[PDB]
UniProtKB/Swiss-Prot annotation, chain B:
Protein name (record): Glutamate receptor ionotropic, NMDA 1
Similarity field: Belongs to the glutamate-gated ion channel (TC 1.A.10.1) family. NR1/GRIN1 subfamily.
Lineage: Eukaryota, Metazoa, Chordata, Craniata, Vertebrata
Tissues where this protein is expressed: Detected throughout the brain, in brain cortex, cerebellum, thalamus and olfactory bulb.
Range covered out of full length: 297 to 346 of 938
Assembly, per entry: Heterotetramer; the NMDAR subunits are modular and harbor tiered domains that function in concert to regulate opening and closing of the cation-selective ion channel pore. Forms heterotetrameric channels composed of two GluN1/zeta subunits (GRIN1), and two identical GluN2/epsilon subunits (GRIN2A, GRIN2B, GRIN2C or GRIN2D) or GluN3 subunits (GRIN3A or GRIN3B) (in vitro). Can also form heterotetrameric channels that contain at least two GluN1 subunits and at least two different GluN2 subunits (or a combination of one GluN2 and one GluN3 subunits) (in vitro).
Location(s), subcellular: Cell membrane; Postsynaptic cell membrane; Synaptic cell membrane; Postsynaptic density membrane
Organism domain of life: Eukaryota
Reported modifications of this chain: NMDA is probably regulated by C-terminal phosphorylation of an isoform of NR1 by PKC. Its phosphorylated state is influenced by the formation of the NMDAR-PPP2CB complex and the NMDAR channel activity.
Domain observations: A hydrophobic region that gives rise to the prediction of a transmembrane span does not cross the membrane, but is part of a discontinuously helical region that dips into the membrane and is probably part of the pore and of the selectivity filter. The extracellular N-terminal domain (ATD) is a site of allosteric regulation to modulate overall receptor function.
From Swiss-Prot, chain C:
UniProt family annotation: Belongs to the glutamate-gated ion channel (TC 1.A.10.1) family. NR2A/GRIN2A subfamily.
Record's comment describing the protein's domains: Contains an N-terminal domain, a ligand-binding domain and a transmembrane domain. Agonist binding to the extracellular ligand-binding domains triggers channel gating.
Glycosylation, residue list: N38
Domain of life (superkingdom): Eukaryota
Localization per record: Cell projection, Dendritic spine; Cell membrane; Synapse; Postsynaptic cell membrane
Record's function text: Component of N-methyl-D-aspartate (NMDA) receptors (NMDARs) that function as heterotetrameric, ligand-gated cation channels with high calcium permeability and voltage-dependent block by Mg(2+). NMDARs participate in synaptic plasticity for learning and memory formation by contributing to the slow phase of excitatory postsynaptic current, long-term synaptic potentiation, and learning.
Residues of the full protein shown: 297 to 345 of 1464
Coiled coil: none
Tissue-wise expression: Detected in brain cortex, olfactory bulb, hippocampus including the dentate gyrus, striatum, thalamus, superior colliculus, inferior colliculus, midbrain and cerebellum (at protein level). Detected in brain cortex, hypothalamus and cerebellum.
Record text on subunit structure and interactions: Heterotetramer. Forms heterotetrameric channels composed of two GluN1/zeta subunits (GRIN1), and two identical GluN2/epsilon subunits (GRIN2A, GRIN2B, GRIN2C or GRIN2D) or GluN3 subunits (GRIN3A or GRIN3B) (in vitro). Can also form heterotetrameric channels that contain at least two GluN1 subunits and at least two different GluN2 subunits (or a combination of one GluN2 and one GluN3 subunits) (in vitro). In vivo, the subunit composition may depend on the expression levels of the different subunits. Found in a complex with GRIN1, GRIN3A and PPP2CB. Found in a complex with GRIN1 and GRIN3B.
Gene of this entry: Grin2a
Protein name: Glutamate receptor ionotropic, NMDA 2A
Organism expressing this protein natively: Rattus norvegicus
Length: 66, 50, 43, 75
């Protein structure tokens, strides 16, 4: 389903490899409406954590938080 | 009455560094001995209870 | 891979897999909490 | 200087005696330069918005002690 992966600044990880992390892979994709959303965030304070969690849960009903 | 007076900053805007005198202020709360009160003689134990 | 494997293996068990909450404002039957205890992916 | 004191504190009788106790803390402690400043947040049945009220009312307030004083919740 809709699954959100969000990171900060660890290991200098960008987002383009996370776009290309699932696309050509997952040959055994049985459900249809499965999408991934990769995001970065500068601030890991709990105000913005709860804010982005509510934004992604309101963001087309994301069922998995990473 | 003590030194190293530090304050917990605006941690909701770009701050993740913890407040270093947290256990210091907690130890101040641990040594809170009182003999006044309508409920009675209030004092925190080693577990922080009445 | 663990999330998609649990979702695909729960789709064969139960049909209505997407069951989410709309928003944080304005105030459980089959979850993957009790499903992916036995999971192994990519060996 | 000034100290914000925040609490989950809605029913106005303990607003009144809380402001009274703020006045009494600046009364029986001499004429020291510290001042007090109250902060009160109200009921939310959803605890997510309780934490929302806590974070957008108490972090910028720089409070030192937070008191939950509402037992009889219907949930
Ligand atoms: C985070 O925000 C600060 C202040 O605007 C800025 O200096 C810093 O470069 C930002 N980090 C990134 C890369 O988002
Ligand atoms: C504050 O604490 C430090 C140790 O953490 C101590 O060295 C110092 O003497 C204290 N206060 C000051 C700045 O004198
Ligand atoms: C002890 O019990 C008495 C009688 O209820 C009352 O003073 C109060 O509840 C308690 N505290 C003290 C030490 O007086
Ligand atoms: C794995 O766990 C699930 C939990 O529902 C169970 O249904 C399934 O039989 C288990 N698979 C085996 C055979 O180990
Ligand atoms: C002091 O107390 C009042 C009580 O409503 C509060 O609204 C205010 O934020 C506090 N002082 C300031 C200017 O922050």
């Amino acid at each position: 389903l809709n699954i959100a992966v969000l990171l900060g600044h660890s290991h200098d990880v960008t987002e383009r490899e996370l776009r290309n992390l699932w696309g050509p892979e997952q040959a055994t994709g049985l459900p249809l409406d499965v999408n991934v959303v990769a995001l970065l965030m500068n601030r890991t304070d709990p105000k913005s954590l709860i804010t982005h969690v509510c934004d992604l849960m309101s963001g087309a009903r994301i069922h998995g938080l990473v | 009455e003590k030194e190293n007076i530090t304050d917990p900053p605006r941690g909701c805007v770009g701050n993740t560094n913890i407040w270093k005198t947290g256990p210091l202020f907690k130890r101040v709360l641990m040594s809170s001995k009182y003999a006044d009160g309508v409920t009675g003689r209030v004092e925190f134990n080693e577990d922080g209870d009445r | 891979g663990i999330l998609t494997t649990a979702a695909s293996s729960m789709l064969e068990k139960f049909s209505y897999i997407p069951e989410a909450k709309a928003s944080c404002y304005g105030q459980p039957l089959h979850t993957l909490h009790q499903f992916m205890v036995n999971v192994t992916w990519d060996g | 200087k000034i100290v914000n004191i925040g609490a989950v504190l809605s029913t106005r009788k303990h607003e009144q005696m809380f402001r009274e106790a703020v006045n009494q803390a600046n009364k029986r402690h001499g004429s020291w330069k510290i001042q007090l400043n109250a902060t009160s947040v109200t009921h939310k049945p959803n605890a997510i918005q309780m934490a929302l009220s806590v974070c957008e009312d108490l972090i910028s307030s720089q409070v030192y002690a937070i008191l939950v004083s509402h037992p009889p919740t219907p949930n």
